[PDB]
Amino acid sequence: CAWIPAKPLVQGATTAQPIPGPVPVANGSIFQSAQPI
Amino acid sequence: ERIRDLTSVQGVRENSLIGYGLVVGLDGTGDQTTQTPFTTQTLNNMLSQLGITVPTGTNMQLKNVAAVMVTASYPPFARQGQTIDVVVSSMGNAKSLRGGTLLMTPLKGVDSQVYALAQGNILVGGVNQLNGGRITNGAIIERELPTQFGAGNTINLQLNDEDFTMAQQITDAINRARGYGSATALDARTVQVRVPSGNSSQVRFLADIQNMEVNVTPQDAKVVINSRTGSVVMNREVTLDSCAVAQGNLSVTGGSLQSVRSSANLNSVVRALNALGATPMDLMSILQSMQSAGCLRAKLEII
Amino acid sequence: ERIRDLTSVQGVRENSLIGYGLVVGLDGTGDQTTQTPFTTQTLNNMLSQLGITVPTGTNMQLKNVAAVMVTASYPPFARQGQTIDVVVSSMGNAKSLRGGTLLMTPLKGVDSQVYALAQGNILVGGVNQLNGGRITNGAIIERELPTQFGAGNTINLQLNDEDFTMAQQITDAINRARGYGSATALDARTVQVRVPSGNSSQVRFLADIQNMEVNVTPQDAKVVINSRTGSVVMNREVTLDSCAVAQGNLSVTGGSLQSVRSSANLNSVVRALNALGATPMDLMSILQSMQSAGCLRAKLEII
Amino acid sequence: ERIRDLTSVQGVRENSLIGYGLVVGLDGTGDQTTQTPFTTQTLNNMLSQLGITVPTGTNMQLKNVAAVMVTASYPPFARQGQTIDVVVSSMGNAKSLRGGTLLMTPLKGVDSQVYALAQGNILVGGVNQLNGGRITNGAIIERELPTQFGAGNTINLQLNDEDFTMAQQITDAINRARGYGSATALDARTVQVRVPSGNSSQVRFLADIQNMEVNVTPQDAKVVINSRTGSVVMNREVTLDSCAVAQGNLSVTGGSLQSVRSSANLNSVVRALNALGATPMDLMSILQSMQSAGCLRAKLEII
Amino acid sequence: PTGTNMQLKNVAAVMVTASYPPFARQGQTIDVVVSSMGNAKSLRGGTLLMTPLKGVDSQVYALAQGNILVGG
Amino acid sequence: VSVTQQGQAAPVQVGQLNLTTFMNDTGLESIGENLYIETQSSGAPNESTPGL
């Protein structure tokens, strides 16, 4: 009964890896913005 | 020596650096440290870094230490070892920073990276501001920014003020001085200049371009009004149209309606407006009403 | 003797050293030690190091001891045994350091390593700051920094102020003095110089370069305004454009609108602005309004 | 007699010694010993060493004893039996050390080893500091430091101030006086000198080198500002550029904007700045603003 | 720490307004207006810290930092 | 000064309240709110454990 395989309520991965940031542009500014949405 | 005063070079820009620090050596005019817990917290952090561990439960009431924020400008083409000026501003309930000293302060950029280290003695005027000071050569540059200068054959001169006429004048001056297709105009603010490939050649080209003389064409008529400081400034292009003006406690030097003549140059405008006998605060309302009516042939900007 | 005043040599830079110490010998003007537990804690640490163990539960109320922070500058090419000046600043609720003595203080770098040891007598002016002092030759250098000077055939002169014209002038002067390809320009701030391999040869080259004379080309027009100290400074490149100015309680010496003539040099600008009869605090607002309008042909920087 | 005033010899350096002691013979101006338990603890230690055991539970309220810290300098090539001066500074709540006597005090080094023993009578000025004093020949040297002097054929002269020109001048003077390859320059601060192997020969070489005369080349322009003491010092290399200066309550001797002429030497700079009629505290702000603008062609250092 | 009483006197929360010019390019400088927001008494000798200037689309178009000039 | 803590079966010692004794008690200068400052006629405050 308790050994029957079941699908959990929250399926899939429960964590996400951070994506490394974009390469900064060689313009002489410290402020670098990611691709805006 | 006018092009260097009218434009800026693309990629040659300044950045802003910020940081937190402690200022010591005050004559009992520092933080109260009872309403500013971060002062004592960061002093304990510094002492722990230096090897002294003050027990967590202890009352520390200082008088010669103030928590301050340090601001600096990262110059173009900054190199490590170079020194820059910094501004030191108190953050909470401090009374003065007259003879203080700024301890080791890392100056972070927008990307939260250390670009300079600040440490020095504050100079405070002493009617004068007591909670703000400046340290000349107070910060040493520690990081360098990559740049694209010297790469490619195109560099953009960016005008401080947008003007198609001024852009065309700068383009024509560069073409008159350094060949046919040396400079082209992209918009009212940007002039594209062709330069030889390399670093030294582009420096030579920019050195010749920067000190060039360009005759400034007449700008747009503009009247700047500052109500917070109570000032009015009119440039040389302001003209007037004939119309009648009335305002409280102002009369002909007689009737309350005073004629204002049609004026072509700035001297005529000044004479016509001084004939009104108006205080500058009254002149602000008069000018706004005349702009609404249409006598003032200028752009009225309130700053 | 101008190149040494306009540039700095790459790798020849100064570092900052910080440390903690105790100042003794005060005339009852030291820490209260009830609001500054670290003073008594570090005094007990010093006594324990010297062989005296004060019991943990004991009330110590001192009057001749102050906890201080010591700041110093690590010079270029510093060698052990050399002496440097230090600044001593009180940290909490101390009243004066007039006749104090600084005990053995290790001066740490950014990497938290001891580079100098500080000990000496403080000199305090005595309107004068009482919680800050200076000790000449107060710290002896203990560690030396490795450097790359003498290696390679390239050394960079870094200009204090970025300028393509000044960089080109320095490059041309070096090329005019010491051969064709002796110096090249990399950007508005850096000039690369070719030197022979070795240590003595590079010292000779730098000795010849440093005292060279370079005629300074005209910089950018700039008006520096310090509102905290109430000062205005205008360089020789500032010009004016004709326009009308009005401000509170200022009038023609008559009407509130005063004409300002077109000015080419600095003497004309000074005469035109003095004709306004403006206090420097009023002159600050006037200058900002004129920069907004466009009469002021200069870069207005508030410091 | 200039080389000895411009450089220091490698290995010929001074160290710092510290120690703890008791000062007796005061006229009721010693420690209260109720807020300073270490005074009574160390007095009991001394009595126990001398053969007197005071019971642990006993109230000792002294008035003629003060706990003091003793500082001294270990000279180069110090030998046991030699005497040095010491500084004696009170540590807690003592009132005066006017006629006190310092008991046997071991002076420890950084390595916590005894290098001298201090005992003598304090001289206190008596506006004068009362809690600090000096004892001439107050400490006898007990330990000697090994050194490498006399070994090898190389000795380094270390300049007090870094300068490529001064290093080259010293090298050229030594080469002009004592053969072709007698001295070489390693960096802006160090000059390497070849000496014969041995002790007496190197002493002779250093004796000839030390009193040599070297013409000092002009240094970097520098303006030193001390806000804590209210002083300004300008060296002979400071020049000025023409520009306008305005500051509160300062006017033409007229308008608030005063012209400052281009100045080449120091006398011209002094005349131009005295024409402003500025108090030194006002002169500090004026100089900082002019450095920001660019008129001041000097390095502004706040100490 | 979250539970702590902070009573400051030298800090004021301000709103910064600016104009984005035609054909504006990165690296160019513009003037800003700084206005207090609540129960502050004066901003005579203050300094504006790093302030991102957003547009209508809530995107950063400029960064503001400098010394304020107040008539007085 | 001892304080009892819950669970702990032994009081914890916090501190000793020390009494100050003067050799001339009448010469103290009354500040007002039930406080006395030492005076040249009542100098040398002796801090002692109470009872000794």
Side-chain angles (χ1 to χ4, degrees):
Chain A
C1 216
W3 296 335
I4 302 308
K7 286 297 177 291
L9 194 63
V10 182
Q11 311 184 127
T14 38
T15 165
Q17 279 285 297
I19 284 319
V23 185
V25 195
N27 68 327
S29 83
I30 290 160
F31 173 87
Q32 306 285 326
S33 68
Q35 170 58 39
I37 307 305
Chain B
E1 292 75 61
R2 269 241 58 92
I3 281 196
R4 82 179 306 155
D5 276 303
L6 293 164
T7 65
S8 55
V9 189
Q10 172 197 58
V12 191
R13 47 159 301 167
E14 277 227 350
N15 293 257
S16 268
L17 304 183
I18 210 181
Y20 171 83
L22 290 178
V23 158
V24 301
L26 310 180
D27 291 88
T29 57
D31 284 342
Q32 306 264 156
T33 68
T34 325
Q35 321 264 66
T36 54
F38 41 83
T39 307
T40 38
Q41 189 183 354
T42 54
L43 196 95
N44 284 142
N45 275 312
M46 158 176 88
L47 287 177
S48 183
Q49 181 62 60
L50 288 165
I52 292 106
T53 314
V54 199
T56 76
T58 319
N59 50 301
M60 263 171 45
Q61 291 219 222
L62 312 162
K63 309 222 217 83
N64 305 153
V65 177
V68 301
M69 270 313 256
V70 190
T71 36
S73 276
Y74 198 76
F77 305 119
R79 315 218 75 94
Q80 64 104 34
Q82 291 199 335
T83 41
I84 56 176
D85 309 8
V86 296
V87 176
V88 172
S89 302
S90 171
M91 266 201 315
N93 77 18
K95 247 86 208 183
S96 174
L97 295 175
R98 174 169 312 248
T101 315
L102 178 76
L103 305 176
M104 192 39 95
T105 294
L107 298 169
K108 318 278 195 59
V110 142
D111 54 358
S112 100
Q113 287 199 108
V114 174
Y115 282 84
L117 297 176
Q119 181 172 111
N121 296 94
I122 321 175
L123 182 55
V124 166
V127 302
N128 284 142
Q129 185 93 180
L130 287 183
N131 279 309
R134 189 173 187 94
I135 314 179
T136 55
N137 306 323
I140 301 176
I141 295 308
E142 305 294 346
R143 197 175 312 271
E144 301 182 353
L145 275 184
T147 206
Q148 278 157 178
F149 176 78
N153 276 65
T154 278
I155 178 81
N156 297 38
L157 299 186
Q158 321 159 172
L159 275 68
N160 296 326
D161 283 283
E162 58 273 51
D163 195 22
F164 288 108
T165 310
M166 281 320 301
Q168 192 57 61
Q169 285 254 312
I170 290 170
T171 299
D172 296 332
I174 301 174
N175 285 340
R176 179 180 61 234
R178 217 141 312 261
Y180 165 74
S182 311
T184 207
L186 305 170
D187 39 63
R189 212 176 189 108
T190 297
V191 171
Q192 173 189 98
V193 198
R194 200 211 37 230
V195 307
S197 183
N199 267 243
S200 205
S201 55
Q202 300 189 4
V203 175
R204 186 107 209 155
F205 211 83
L206 292 182
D208 317 341
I209 293 301
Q210 252 188 353
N211 285 316
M212 235 163 254
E213 272 289 340
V214 156
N215 207 5
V216 286
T217 57
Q219 294 314 87
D220 303 341
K222 190 206 262 253
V223 180
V224 160
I225 286 192
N226 202 333
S227 194
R228 298 188 306 258
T229 72
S231 52
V232 181
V233 172
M234 330 212 279
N235 70 352
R236 55 142 65 233
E237 283 311 310
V238 169
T239 79
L240 284 187
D241 211 7
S242 183
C243 59
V245 169
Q247 213 189 19
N249 298 318
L250 261 60
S251 67
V252 177
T253 58
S256 67
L257 214 63
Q258 316 176 61
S259 290
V260 172
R261 284 217 290 111
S262 212
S263 310
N265 45 90
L266 195 56
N267 284 323
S268 307
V269 172
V270 170
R271 179 165 50 247
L273 291 186
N274 283 338
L276 292 173
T279 304
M281 305 78 207
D282 299 309
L283 190 67
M284 278 156 219
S285 311
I286 289 171
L287 282 175
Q288 208 174 44
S289 287
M290 294 180 42
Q291 193 267 351
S292 285
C295 322
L296 182 63
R297 320 300 293 131
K299 195 122 175 105
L300 188 66
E301 219 210 348
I302 318 168
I303 67 154
Chain C
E1 292 75 61
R2 269 241 58 92
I3 282 196
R4 82 179 306 155
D5 276 303
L6 293 165
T7 65
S8 55
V9 189
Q10 172 197 58
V12 191
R13 47 159 301 167
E14 277 226 350
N15 293 257
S16 268
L17 304 183
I18 210 181
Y20 171 83
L22 290 178
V23 158
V24 301
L26 310 180
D27 291 88
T29 57
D31 284 343
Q32 306 264 156
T33 68
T34 325
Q35 321 264 66
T36 54
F38 41 83
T39 307
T40 38
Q41 189 183 354
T42 54
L43 196 95
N44 284 142
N45 275 312
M46 158 176 88
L47 287 177
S48 183
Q49 181 62 60
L50 288 165
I52 292 106
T53 314
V54 198
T56 76
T58 319
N59 50 301
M60 263 171 45
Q61 291 219 222
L62 312 162
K63 309 222 217 83
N64 305 153
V65 177
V68 301
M69 270 313 256
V70 190
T71 36
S73 276
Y74 198 76
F77 305 119
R79 315 218 75 95
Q80 64 104 34
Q82 291 199 335
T83 41
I84 56 176
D85 309 8
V86 296
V87 176
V88 172
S89 302
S90 171
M91 266 201 315
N93 77 18
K95 247 86 208 183
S96 174
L97 295 175
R98 174 169 312 248
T101 315
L102 178 76
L103 305 176
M104 192 39 95
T105 294
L107 298 169
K108 318 278 195 59
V110 141
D111 54 358
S112 100
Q113 287 199 108
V114 174
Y115 282 84
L117 297 176
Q119 181 172 111
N121 296 94
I122 321 174
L123 182 55
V124 166
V127 302
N128 284 142
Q129 185 92 180
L130 287 183
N131 279 309
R134 189 173 187 94
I135 314 179
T136 55
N137 307 323
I140 301 176
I141 295 308
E142 305 294 346
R143 197 175 312 271
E144 302 182 353
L145 275 184
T147 206
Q148 278 157 178
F149 176 78
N153 276 65
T154 278
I155 178 81
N156 297 38
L157 299 186
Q158 321 159 172
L159 275 68
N160 296 326
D161 283 283
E162 58 273 51
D163 195 22
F164 288 108
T165 310
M166 281 320 301
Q168 192 57 61
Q169 285 254 312
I170 290 170
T171 299
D172 296 332
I174 301 174
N175 285 340
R176 179 180 61 234
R178 217 141 312 261
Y180 165 74
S182 311
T184 207
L186 305 170
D187 39 63
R189 212 176 189 108
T190 297
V191 171
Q192 173 189 98
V193 198
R194 200 211 37 230
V195 307
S197 183
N199 267 243
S200 205
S201 55
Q202 300 189 4
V203 175
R204 186 107 209 155
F205 211 83
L206 292 182
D208 317 341
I209 293 301
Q210 252 188 353
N211 285 316
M212 235 163 254
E213 272 289 340
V214 156
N215 207 5
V216 286
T217 57
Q219 294 314 87
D220 303 341
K222 190 206 262 253
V223 180
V224 160
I225 286 192
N226 202 333
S227 194
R228 298 188 306 258
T229 72
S231 52
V232 181
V233 172
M234 330 212 279
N235 70 352
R236 55 142 65 233
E237 283 311 310
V238 169
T239 79
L240 284 187
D241 211 7
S242 183
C243 59
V245 169
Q247 213 189 18
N249 298 318
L250 261 60
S251 67
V252 177
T253 58
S256 67
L257 214 63
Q258 316 176 61
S259 290
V260 172
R261 284 217 290 111
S262 212
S263 310
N265 45 90
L266 195 56
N267 284 323
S268 307
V269 172
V270 170
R271 179 166 50 247
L273 291 186
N274 283 338
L276 292 173
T279 304
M281 305 78 207
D282 299 309
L283 190 67
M284 278 156 219
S285 311
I286 289 171
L287 282 175
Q288 208 174 44
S289 287
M290 294 180 42
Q291 193 267 351
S292 285
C295 322
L296 182 63
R297 320 300 293 131
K299 195 122 175 105
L300 188 66
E301 219 210 348
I302 318 168
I303 67 154
Chain D
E1 292 75 61
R2 269 241 58 92
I3 282 196
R4 82 179 306 155
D5 276 303
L6 293 164
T7 65
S8 55
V9 189
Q10 172 197 58
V12 191
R13 47 159 301 167
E14 277 227 350
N15 293 257
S16 268
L17 304 183
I18 210 181
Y20 171 83
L22 290 178
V23 158
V24 301
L26 310 180
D27 291 88
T29 57
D31 284 342
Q32 306 264 156
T33 68
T34 325
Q35 321 264 66
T36 54
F38 41 83
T39 307
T40 38
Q41 189 183 354
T42 54
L43 196 95
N44 285 142
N45 275 312
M46 158 176 88
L47 287 177
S48 183
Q49 181 62 60
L50 288 165
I52 292 106
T53 314
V54 198
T56 76
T58 319
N59 50 301
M60 263 171 45
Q61 291 219 222
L62 312 162
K63 309 222 217 83
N64 305 153
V65 177
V68 301
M69 270 314 255
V70 190
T71 36
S73 276
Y74 198 76
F77 305 119
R79 315 218 75 94
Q80 64 104 34
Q82 291 199 335
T83 41
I84 56 176
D85 309 8
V86 296
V87 176
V88 172
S89 303
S90 171
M91 266 201 315
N93 77 18
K95 247 86 208 183
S96 174
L97 295 175
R98 174 169 312 248
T101 315
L102 178 76
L103 305 176
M104 192 39 95
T105 294
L107 299 169
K108 318 278 195 59
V110 141
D111 54 358
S112 100
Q113 287 199 108
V114 174
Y115 282 84
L117 297 176
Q119 181 172 111
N121 296 94
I122 321 175
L123 182 55
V124 166
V127 302
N128 284 142
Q129 185 92 180
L130 287 183
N131 279 309
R134 189 173 187 94
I135 314 179
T136 55
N137 307 323
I140 301 176
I141 295 308
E142 305 294 346
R143 197 175 312 271
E144 302 182 353
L145 275 184
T147 206
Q148 278 157 178
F149 176 78
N153 276 65
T154 278
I155 178 81
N156 297 38
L157 299 186
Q158 321 159 172
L159 275 68
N160 296 326
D161 283 283
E162 58 273 51
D163 195 22
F164 288 108
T165 310
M166 281 320 301
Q168 192 57 61
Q169 285 254 312
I170 290 170
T171 299
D172 296 332
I174 301 175
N175 285 340
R176 179 180 61 234
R178 217 141 312 261
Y180 165 74
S182 311
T184 207
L186 305 170
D187 39 63
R189 212 176 189 108
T190 298
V191 171
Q192 173 189 98
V193 198
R194 200 211 37 230
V195 307
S197 183
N199 266 244
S200 205
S201 55
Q202 300 189 3
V203 175
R204 186 107 209 155
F205 211 83
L206 292 182
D208 317 341
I209 293 301
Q210 252 188 353
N211 285 316
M212 235 163 254
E213 272 289 340
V214 156
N215 207 5
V216 286
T217 57
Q219 294 314 87
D220 303 341
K222 190 206 262 253
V223 180
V224 160
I225 286 192
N226 202 333
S227 194
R228 298 188 306 258
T229 72
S231 52
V232 181
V233 172
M234 331 212 279
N235 70 352
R236 55 142 65 233
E237 283 311 310
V238 169
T239 79
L240 283 187
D241 211 7
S242 183
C243 59
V245 169
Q247 213 189 18
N249 298 318
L250 261 60
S251 67
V252 177
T253 58
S256 67
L257 214 63
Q258 316 176 61
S259 290
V260 172
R261 284 217 290 111
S262 212
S263 310
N265 45 90
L266 195 56
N267 284 323
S268 307
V269 172
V270 170
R271 179 166 50 247
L273 291 186
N274 283 338
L276 292 173
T279 304
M281 305 78 207
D282 299 309
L283 190 67
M284 278 156 219
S285 311
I286 289 171
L287 282 175
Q288 208 174 44
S289 287
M290 294 180 42
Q291 193 267 351
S292 285
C295 322
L296 182 63
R297 320 300 293 131
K299 195 122 175 105
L300 188 66
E301 219 210 348
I302 318 168
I303 67 154
Chain E
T2 76
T4 319
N5 50 301
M6 263 171 45
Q7 291 219 222
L8 312 162
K9 309 222 217 83
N10 305 153
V11 177
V14 301
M15 270 314 256
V16 190
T17 36
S19 276
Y20 198 76
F23 305 119
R25 315 218 75 94
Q26 64 104 34
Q28 291 199 335
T29 41
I30 56 176
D31 309 8
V32 296
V33 176
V34 172
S35 302
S36 171
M37 266 201 315
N39 77 18
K41 247 86 208 183
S42 174
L43 295 175
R44 174 169 312 248
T47 315
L48 178 76
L49 305 176
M50 192 39 95
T51 294
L53 299 169
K54 318 278 195 59
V56 142
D57 54 358
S58 100
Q59 287 199 108
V60 174
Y61 282 84
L63 297 176
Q65 181 172 111
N67 296 94
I68 321 175
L69 182 55
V70 166
Chain F
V1 177
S2 310
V3 287
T4 281
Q5 285 253 28
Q6 173 144 260
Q8 184 144 339
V12 184
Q13 301 113 298
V14 184
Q16 199 113 31
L17 272 157
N18 276 347
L19 289 179
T20 307
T21 306
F22 296 98
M23 61 195 148
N24 161 246
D25 251 348
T26 297
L28 298 163
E29 160 131 355
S30 311
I31 327 177
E33 47 198 286
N34 279 334
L35 300 171
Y36 308 107
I37 291 168
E38 76 158 17
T39 284
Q40 280 277 30
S41 171
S42 100
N46 174 2
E47 180 190 357
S48 56
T49 88
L52 294 325

